[PDB]
Amino acid sequence: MKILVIQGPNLNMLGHRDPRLYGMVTLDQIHEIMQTFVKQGNLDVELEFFQTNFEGEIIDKIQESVGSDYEGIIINPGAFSHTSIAIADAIMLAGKPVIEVHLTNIQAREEFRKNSYTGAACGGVIMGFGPLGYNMALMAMVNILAEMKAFQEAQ
Amino acid sequence: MKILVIQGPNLNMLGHRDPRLYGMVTLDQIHEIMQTFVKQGNLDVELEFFQTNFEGEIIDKIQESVGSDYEGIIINPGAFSHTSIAIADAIMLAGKPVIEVHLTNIQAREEFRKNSYTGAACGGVIMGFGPLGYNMALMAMVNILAEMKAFQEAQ
Amino acid sequence: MKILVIQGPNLNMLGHRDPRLYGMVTLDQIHEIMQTFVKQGNLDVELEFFQTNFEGEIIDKIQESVGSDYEGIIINPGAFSHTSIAIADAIMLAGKPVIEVHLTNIQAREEFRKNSYTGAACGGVIMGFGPLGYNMALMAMVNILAEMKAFQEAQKNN
Amino acid sequence: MKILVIQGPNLNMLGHRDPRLYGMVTLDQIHEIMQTFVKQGNLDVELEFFQTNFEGEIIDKIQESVGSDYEGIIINPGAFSHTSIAIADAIMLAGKPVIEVHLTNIQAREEFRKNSYTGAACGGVIMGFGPLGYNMALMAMVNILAEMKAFQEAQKNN
Amino acid sequence: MKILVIQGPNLNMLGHRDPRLYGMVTLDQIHEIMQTFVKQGNLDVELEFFQTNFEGEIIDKIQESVGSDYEGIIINPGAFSHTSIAIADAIMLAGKPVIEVHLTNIQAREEFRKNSYTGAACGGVIMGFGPLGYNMALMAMVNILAEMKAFQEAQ
Amino acid sequence: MKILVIQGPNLNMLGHRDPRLYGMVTLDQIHEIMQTFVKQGNLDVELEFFQTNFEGEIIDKIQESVGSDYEGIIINPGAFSHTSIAIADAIMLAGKPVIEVHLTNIQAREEFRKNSYTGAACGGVIMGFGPLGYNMALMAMVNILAEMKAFQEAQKNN
Amino acid sequence: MKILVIQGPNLNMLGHRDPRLYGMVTLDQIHEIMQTFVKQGNLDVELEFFQTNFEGEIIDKIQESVGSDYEGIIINPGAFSHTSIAIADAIMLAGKPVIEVHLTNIQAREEFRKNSYTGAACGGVIMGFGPLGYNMALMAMVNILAEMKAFQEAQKNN
Amino acid sequence: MKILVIQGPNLNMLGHRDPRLYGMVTLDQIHEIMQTFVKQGNLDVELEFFQTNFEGEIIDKIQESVGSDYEGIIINPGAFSHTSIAIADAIMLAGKPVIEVHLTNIQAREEFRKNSYTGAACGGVIMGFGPLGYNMALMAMVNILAEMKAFQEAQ
Amino acid sequence: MKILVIQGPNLNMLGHRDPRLYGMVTLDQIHEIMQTFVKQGNLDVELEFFQTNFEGEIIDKIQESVGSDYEGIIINPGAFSHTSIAIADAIMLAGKPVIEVHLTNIQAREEFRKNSYTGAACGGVIMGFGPLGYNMALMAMVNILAEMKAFQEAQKNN
Amino acid sequence: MKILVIQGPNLNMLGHRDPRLYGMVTLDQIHEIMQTFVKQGNLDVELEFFQTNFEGEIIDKIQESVGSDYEGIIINPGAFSHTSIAIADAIMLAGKPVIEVHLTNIQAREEFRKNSYTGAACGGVIMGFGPLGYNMALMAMVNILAEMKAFQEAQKNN
Amino acid sequence: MKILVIQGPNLNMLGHRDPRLYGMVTLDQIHEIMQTFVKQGNLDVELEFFQTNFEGEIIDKIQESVGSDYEGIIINPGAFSHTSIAIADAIMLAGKPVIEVHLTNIQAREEFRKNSYTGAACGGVIMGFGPLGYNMALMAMVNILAEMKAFQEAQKNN
Amino acid sequence: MKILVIQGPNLNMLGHRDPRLYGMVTLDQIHEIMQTFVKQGNLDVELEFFQTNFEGEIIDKIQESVGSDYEGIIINPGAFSHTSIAIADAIMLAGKPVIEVHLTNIQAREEFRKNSYTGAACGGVIMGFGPLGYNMALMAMVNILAEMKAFQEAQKNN
Ligand SMILES: O=C1[C@@H](O)[C@H](O)C[C@](O)(C(=O)O)[C@@H]1Cc1c(F)c(F)c(F)c(F)c1F
Ligand SMILES: O=C1[C@@H](O)[C@H](O)C[C@](O)(C(=O)O)[C@@H]1Cc1c(F)c(F)c(F)c(F)c1F
């Protein structure tokens, strides 16, 4: 069970600064924490991680997952959450569970961050938990897919 | 470690109808699922559940948790999320982790549901996962408190 | 038929002043008039009346009616019309006809009274007829419930 | 009493399709039902019916009623509800009761249907009861006109 | 010099009621007052008056004045001032002076009366003077046309 | 196929004012060009032309097309595009393809021209090609109708 | 004169959270200070205190004051200031002076705090003086009541 | 019968430039044209003219006319029309006819010019006629005062 | 303590127009009443009064108070409350307590009066008590200053 | 004439998702149909196709067309229609006809799709005809180019 | 060249506090720095400085410059940037280069500071560089005026 | 000092047309002018230039500069100024001075150009001086960096 984790613009800069709202934990460290979570719960998942500052590369990537062996996507589209109708359209046609994560609470900052076109397209949205948000999303992804598979077999 | 779970207006009507967006699982069933999660992960938590259709009873309850042995609150304020400045003010003065859950994705419905005064006051917000959202919040609550306790002891 | 009549905040103050914008008839008198409209029409309708200033009591009451032997609700949610998404959510799950009444025309007053969340969730809305609006809702509820019965019997024999 | 019943744009297309959002009863049938509600109630009421797709014909008609022997208007201005300040201006000078009816609940549809200029100028508004709304307006108009008569006689003897 | 005076919806109801903001003077009386003004100042104008409650009849009429011997239009489009893009488009193509009159001050009533699509298309707008507004417009019309004729001859 | 071409307010004034933003081609010339487009394509199309400055005349004509011999409508509602919910409602019940045409690009002018109630009710909208837009609407209409027909025989056979 | 002091949601949490934006003075201490202000001014005022987190309890209390022994109300509706048309409606029918107090300046915080439905229904509003605001409301209330009374005897005598 | 004519900010710059929307006629020339109008119609009025770029001087001036022998005010508050609640409050308490004039059509320019707080307080508003607007206002002022005087005497 | 009282545009016209919404009490009378309030309270306060219709004169005066002998400002900026960011900026740098007063309740009039830039810059705002508001501002100012001073000696001693 | 066809984000996913709102026809099939439309019309047109999910790749391509051999552009910018001022700016300096196409009617979907920055920069916009829209854009482009050319020789000769 | 430097409301309070958001340099010091930037660059520029809190004095001053021997204006209109259509109107008729300066970045503060009417009328705007912004405007004005001179001479010899 | 100069979408098209709204100087020429302003001022500044139409390349580039030997950024984000929260986020974490430049005055054009997310995150913004704006940013960056150095040395010896 391959889960694709997509990390949007500026997420690669975690650690390398603004620790007063994001922390000194890096993105590579968050990805280690996700692997730890997989093993600690013995969840049968194999993660692939992708970060980019390009809207088009996020779109290419979601598209590429269509009819691939990726069963689900966990995404933090970064500032593109608030602006990217194109990424939301891509999420809409993905044909699999997509879950949005934000490290910060996007209801609790500037007004321009409240809208998320991408989160409106996702099955579910997690915000405000920092790095832990991504393990939260892993957990949901497993339950969502297992549940979908029960509807498969028992039909 | 007592965690208070507060469930707002109409949450008691889960099961008893609109299963086409909320499902036939009842609120009492969600609370059983949370207990199952506690035992299955052997988390040292003791939950207390409270449901009400009164804004004032949610406020009384959050207030009552101040300087009590409740260490955290998981809340689904229901339709009061979008309207209740009074509940948000209560959340602000609670002095402990508060986490908001919604069964549905509130970015993906009517425009009047997008605002959450209460979620803006909470540390973190979870939406769109159905019943599972509450186990997601349990998991965050444990990590948040454990982490706070590390900052306690190692200081 | 048991019909439940819910009267929201400040409706109990009818005729205990503002005899200009609302008249000098009391809530108790309006309810008497409704009873008299049933009795006179020989309608098989038992009315039950509930006034409250509490949003949560209105939701409690609408919830209580689910799986009860109430066939319908006539509601004036008062000021909560404009603000209560919670009461609209309760109406949406009521599973029975709910008719909203306002004594005044809420299109013809302050801007803040124009939105009615509860009204939008109700099948039908009556406004600006004063106390008469409640007798209009009675007439409507009876006709709605008859229609519903005839539809239900005529489908069960097919 | 002569009551004038004005039916605005596209109301003539009732039952000539969209049998889902509006039903399959025709405008002619609704008017028959209204006639039958008068006859059956032995109401001293003569109904006159007017449908038009023209804003100017509706205003002409409301104007024509001033100093006429029409005692009241029941109006469904259709889409002109939301846009016609001109028809609201005509209602405001009508000098007689005007009741607005909508078959559908205009609080529960597209945003552009929520404003009713004409509704705000009418004494009272009924919406979301389908064809029944017209019989509800009839009931109301009769009661309004009675009240008006009793008030007028009881002041002239004082 | 023919001047067409166009009077919009409900103007025919002047006198016949709401004298508490419009007065007991009728529309036919305003048209007499305009003729009085023509003779009293010995202005070489011949007025034609047209009232209608139809948007389409106002449009037909303005159109009909194009390449006619009407040299100018004085118009009170009534409630169509606030709504009629079609009447404004007609005014725009009229090819002659058009002047808007309102009996009431439309900056000083409801918010829905503040916009005038038609007045924005007119050369000039007069409001708030009652019946006198129309003699004011007559006076401007004469000066405007005389001035245009000076630019004609002296070119 | 009889196709109805409805032209809204002021369209009759083409080539008789504003050579700048519109053309110097008249409305009659546009209609000749459309006829020419049919005849030389040897299309089996009989065009019917109707211009009016009256909203209600447009609604009358759309209604008259219901259950008629007309298989489609090409419409430029003029300034009523932006204002007429009534005409949009008529389009919604037309029961046949309706194509909206504008000479000008309505996304690129005043803010008040951007909304088209009528365009949102139409299946397709063409704008900003000038008189050519109408021939584009003819091409589309023939193709829509041929596809619709091939579909009705595709289905009657399974 | 009995004066009623109504304190809305969370006001009971003063001095038990957020020393920063509010004080460290408790609600009971504020109430002692008001009593102290009366007693030392030798004012003939009997204060009655009521705090609640329930909108409906506030409306109940305002209503209960109609035709009672209370001559005035000093109110801080808390967050319900910004949301409660219901409480504003209650204030409008109170029939006696109602003064709104806020500890903080509600013009100088979040945008959602700027509106006060309740303040607009009150005769006067005091904000941003902290606990002192309540003593200012006491001073005003005594002066309003004394002026009102002197006026009732000014008039009965001519 | 003294009529005060108040001319607001930048009106003194008429002539001295932007003749492509205002013309080469100066303010002093407009005031001569008003005197010409008085004599030509033999109207018993004595005008006083005041121009200023100060909001406070317009307010002082309107105030000063209260209980003076000024019977009416014709005002072009300039850009202060759109912004000056203080000037509108002054107009409201003036106790005599006040008429607003604009040389340009303020419904037909930028959106920030559409509001006129001052015109909403005035009895009537004239726009879009250039210099002639002020003679239009003179004419209305005479009729308004004469009419008020008929209501005086015949009462 | 010298306290400066700044009165904005049109405040000088009190009692010389609109007996209705304002009083019939003049501005000079209000100023006498304030002096009277000080003298009878045996407050050590020397009031200085300044009225102007000029925004820039208000800003000049607030600035002139910086590093002066004045310990506080009571201000009614009149219509400039709603418009003057410049005056709000001046208030922000004043370096001493500034209290805003309105005779009327600015939450309960036209929409354009609701914003107060100046009020948001002031520590506290009093509205809708009429001339009494000014005596309330005096009471508050003395109390604010006494508390501030007691604090400066509370701190120099530890 | 070489005509460039630019297809924006997700257009490559046609027929590989959402048979409902779009077709089941693929992007390559649409491009074949356009080629077919040229060849059978014996048009002298050489089409060049470019799809990308990158805003900057669209801007690169429009720029690359400046002073190139391409005489026109047919563009569907996809979701960038609603967001991309950058692409609109590129269109504005393109120096040749640019036609915008949408498969769907963007006036009739979510509010966020209504604006098209790119459409307002284009000379003409076609929407809501599905894949046929592209052939309509081809017809228009040939006609625009032929008219432009006839004009350049109309003018060089006087 | 004579360049006029206009400093609007509260700019005289620079360095007389808020040493945090604005710094501790005075207006007089900034003007000294500008003088020193001229002297050091051996620029043939005479600077004239004017500060005022009066909107009317700023307009007077800009008007006074018309037909004067001032070749340019550097203006910081302070809070009047956001509100003064009157000062923008004066700038528009100045007939010479006008550059707006703000010490702070007005895009990065309260919403009410984002609009600059005066800035929109100026050729160019500089913000968020503190006192340096004035030296930047000096550099720009010199370069603008040189360019203007070279253009004027090189056209007069053609 | 190494200063990085980022030029956003369509800036490469300068002087390759719209010689009216933007002039006929090229991007390459502007960069030459900047180089010449350094050389002539004998500034110890090495300029590096980067143009791109890709939002992601601009973010990549700003990120690349973190922990590099670039001391500062001069940026014109072009149309991405108004839309890119992503580029603003990159600016906010740059940890070095970033100055925004626009050739045109973005307060004086379409409404959609008034917001600058990137500008608000930059320390300072320059607009409406054409190519000169870049030399103004150079002057500023040098002065900013000097100030920063003097501050840093004078604190390390304390
Ligand atoms: O014409 C309208 C709508 O424009 C209006 O919003 C509701 C409305 O007034 C009502 O519910 O009665 C009416 C609804 C309506 C229609 F919109 C319509 F198109 C019809 F053909 C029709 F028969 C009909 F009843
Ligand atoms: O009537 C209108 C406008 O009101 C609409 O905005 C565009 C519109 O639908 C179009 O571009 O076709 C049309 C434009 C228009 C006109 F606005 C107009 F005034 C004419 F005289 C005319 F001939 C014409 F074509």
Ligand SMILES: O=C1[C@@H](O)[C@H](O)C[C@](O)(C(=O)O)[C@@H]1Cc1c(F)c(F)c(F)c(F)c1F
């Ligand atoms: O309850 C509120 C706010 O919601 C309101 O905006 C201001 C308010 O009315 C005031 O300043 O008095 C009050 C402020 C306020 C609180 F918001 C609050 F959470 C408290 F615990 C409290 F004690 C308190 F005073």
Ligand SMILES: O=C1[C@@H](O)[C@H](O)C[C@](O)(C(=O)O)[C@@H]1Cc1c(F)c(F)c(F)c(F)c1F
């Ligand atoms: O000048 C104003 C108004 O513009 C403001 O809205 C209220 C206001 O600040 C107050 O209530 O004190 C004040 C009200 C006001 C006036 F508006 C006014 F015109 C007066 F002549 C007057 F005496 C007066 F007090």
Ligand SMILES: O=C1[C@@H](O)[C@H](O)C[C@](O)(C(=O)O)[C@@H]1Cc1c(F)c(F)c(F)c(F)c1F
């Ligand atoms: O990309 C889009 C939308 O974002 C745009 O609103 C309409 C749009 O430009 C059109 O109707 O052509 C296009 C619609 C659209 C999609 F939104 C989309 F996700 C696809 F996969 C697709 F194939 C498609 F055509």
Ligand SMILES: O=C1[C@@H](O)[C@H](O)C[C@](O)(C(=O)O)[C@@H]1Cc1c(F)c(F)c(F)c(F)c1F
């Ligand atoms: O790209 C843009 C605009 O989107 C922006 O609003 C102004 C802008 O940032 C500026 O004035 O520098 C820049 C203006 C602009 C362009 F919009 C453009 F299309 C060009 F080709 C160009 F060379 C150019 F400079």
